[PDB]
Design a protein around this ligand. Structure first.
Ligand SMILES: CCNC(=O)CCNC(=O)[C@H](O)C(C)(C)COP(=O)(O)OP(=O)(O)OC[C@H]1O[C@@H](n2cnc3c(N)ncnc32)[C@H](O)[C@@H]1OP(=O)(O)O
Ligand SMILES: CCNC(=O)CCNC(=O)[C@H](O)C(C)(C)COP(=O)(O)OP(=O)(O)OC[C@H]1O[C@@H](n2cnc3c(N)ncnc32)[C@H](O)[C@@H]1OP(=O)(O)O
Ligand SMILES: CCNC(=O)CCNC(=O)[C@H](O)C(C)(C)COP(=O)(O)OP(=O)(O)OC[C@H]1O[C@@H](n2cnc3c(N)ncnc32)[C@H](O)[C@@H]1OP(=O)(O)O
Ligand SMILES: O=C(N[C@H](CO)[C@H](O)c1ccc([N+](=O)[O-])cc1)C(Cl)Cl
Ligand SMILES: O=C(N[C@H](CO)[C@H](O)c1ccc([N+](=O)[O-])cc1)C(Cl)Cl
Ligand SMILES: O=C(N[C@H](CO)[C@H](O)c1ccc([N+](=O)[O-])cc1)C(Cl)Cl
Lengths: 208, 208, 208
């Protein structure tokens, strides 16, 4: 097992290896219950091409065991053609030669900052998860998620948002995830409360 | 790992081994992310009896990693009896001797032709998936699916059908999945479009 | 593989090892399709502390392969604070020193008697499943379940109850799961039917 205990995961920056996975600071993944390194979480991601959708993960994300990001767009299957069979890809059968390539990209999968993904959640290709969002365990994400939204279910739904629209707006304005570590340690006492307005002030103050 | 890469699966005809799994041509399974051969996808399927429900898979199916077909009907559990405990099966405890066998078959699980199953989809016992249907990833199929229907969710729902009722009817009439490989290669250019009516004509023509 | 066959599981009492998992008699788990012993089914459960929520499982339960019980309450993450990042736990970065511990227990997870859990069902922290309940496969349980209720889905829903409200009430009154094995073998013929009223009488009789 890549992990020594269920209670201690390892940084993304120290286990990612596919060049198409760009991870941010402090972000981590604890997958003892699935034994494999974060790399294998990005399914169907080619480390060999640069013409493909990439998995981008913000900073301070906490990724739960077994999470999975389905990549490679449609994988060559086209529901809108008469046949969803990847003829073009079965290069070993001649009959299927003239077969055209039905593959088509879906765009980078983006995971914002401070996103908490529950064990075994699965993201479809091309979705974009907003900052602070919380992805429920086993939630199957079929689309974009709003910042600070709480989703869950198959298909994933917004259960509610973490803070007030206004609070959210403030949180987005000060983007503490881009703050110099020194300021993070400074505002620390306030990061451990739900007093966004307090935190906002402390911010505005120091900015001076 | 039974598979060498996430981007290349192997034919069903070349890995199936349980006598109760009947697979069609070109149908395949790509399960690098789950390491095991297709055989273990048919859960609780006995290769030793012939008095059991069988997993039948049509031709040109594309089965995603981790797919799973729950077999053995009710497995001896009966929700309608005073106790769902398989007394009859705990043959090691005498008290549970007179226990009657609550096992009961549910019927062959049938997967039509050209069915695209998403990674980690799970089918309950006895369901029948129609031709061309698309099974969303992680979708839990609790019942029959219509030809060309797109299902997904836990429990799985029809999101929509791939083509028009009429188009569908045409597609079912020419069953290109039973066409001689030679004709398949012939109509190939048209199989890579969504012009069912065009394809229908090309068919009717050649039939002459 | 801890198991020799998909058709024969092993008692809980003979494989559990974490001191915080209290299992009842005859209860068992058949997880050949997931290879690991029941112990690893209780995720994030510390065998080293006694100040933590425990997984309690009643008697005569039939636990399906891959079932999973998410423990450790919130795991230190607090959706209601400005940041769901477990600062207090990243003890290797000084900036995050004053970080307060956001961990908070959710209470023992309780699985009543005669509960039939489907392969791959997942229970959230703190839920309490009532006696006789049936948990559908892949069902994600986000809350309490009623005795004799049938749930399923992500999130799990009650599909219906196994017996009549009255029948249920009778079943709860005679709690056959606490009956001396001798009486269990006696009423055996009636335990293999859906005649709760018959069973009730047979009970009342013998009680005399
Ligand atoms: C690292 C591994 N850790 C994990 O995977 C744990 C991550 N935790 C989760 O995903 C949690 O379930 C959540 C944070 C979403 C739960 O938060 P919270 O306690 O606020 O949800 P609640 O318990 O108040 O329930 C609120 C609603 O959310 C729903 N809900 C909770 N978790 C989920 C989930 N994973 N998927 C879908 N719905 C969910 C409940 O069904 C409920 O509403 P209902 O009674 O109308 O059906
Ligand atoms: C071999 C491994 N490959 C795979 O597993 C990939 C298979 N692909 C899938 O299962 C795909 O998600 C689908 C083909 C179903 C998506 O197709 P499509 O793009 O037409 O769905 P859309 O993105 O238009 O969304 C349409 C609806 O389908 C739903 N949907 C998509 N995928 C799923 C799924 N797996 N389960 C349930 N619902 C789904 C969406 O929630 C949406 O409706 P909403 O906004 O009202 O909630
Ligand atoms: C040890 C490994 N064994 C297993 O995992 C098998 C356990 N079996 C299950 O979980 C079964 O699916 C059940 C016992 C729940 C099915 O029982 P039953 O046959 O009475 O359900 P039905 O087939 O009558 O269908 C009734 C409803 O339950 C729903 N249902 C059945 N199984 C599930 C499930 N796992 N999750 C959610 N809903 C479910 C169906 O969708 C259906 O209603 P709908 O047509 O309105 O959508
Ligand atoms: O095995 C094959 N395809 C599967 C998907 O059905 C394989 O996992 C895959 C995934 C992505 C892909 N792509 O998008 O380039 C190609 C093949 C074809 Cl080569 Cl037959
Ligand atoms: O272990 C047992 N049963 C499980 C299901 O609870 C086993 O996986 C199984 C599956 C199917 C079956 N059948 O239908 O013949 C019997 C046992 C009994 Cl032997 Cl205690
Ligand atoms: O790796 C870590 N935490 C994860 C959860 O994000 C680990 O799986 C865990 C689970 C439970 C826990 N607890 O509640 O005591 C602590 C860490 C922190 Cl040490 Cl960075």
């Amino acid at each position: 097992n890549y992990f020594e205990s269920p209670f201690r995961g390892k940084l993304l920056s120290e286990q990612v290896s596919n060049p198409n996975i760009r991870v941010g600071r402090y972000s981590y993944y604890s997958g003892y219950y699935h034994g494999h390194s974060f790399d294998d979480c990005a399914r169907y991601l080619m480390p060999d091409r640069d013409d493909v959708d990439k998995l981008v993960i913000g900073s301070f994300c906490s990724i739960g065991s077994g999470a999975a990001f389905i990549m490679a767009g449609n994988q060559g299957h086209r529901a809108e053609w008469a046949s969803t069979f990847p003829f073009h890809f079965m290069h070993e059968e001649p009959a299927f030669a003239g077969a055209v390539n039905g593959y088509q990209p879906a765009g980078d999968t983006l995971i914002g900052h401070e996103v908490w993904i529950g064990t075994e959640a699965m993201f479809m290709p091309g979705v974009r998860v907003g900052h602070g969002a919380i992805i429920g365990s086993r939630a199957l994400v079929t689309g974009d998620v709003e910042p600070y939204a709480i989703v869950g279910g198959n298909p994933a739904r917004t259960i509610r948002k973490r803070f007030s629209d206004g609070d959210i707006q403030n949180l987005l304005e000060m983007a503490w995830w881009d703050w110099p570590l020194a300021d993070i340690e400074a505002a620390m006492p306030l990061l451990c409360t739900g007093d966004i307005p307090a935190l906002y002030q402390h911010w505005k103050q120091r900015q001076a």
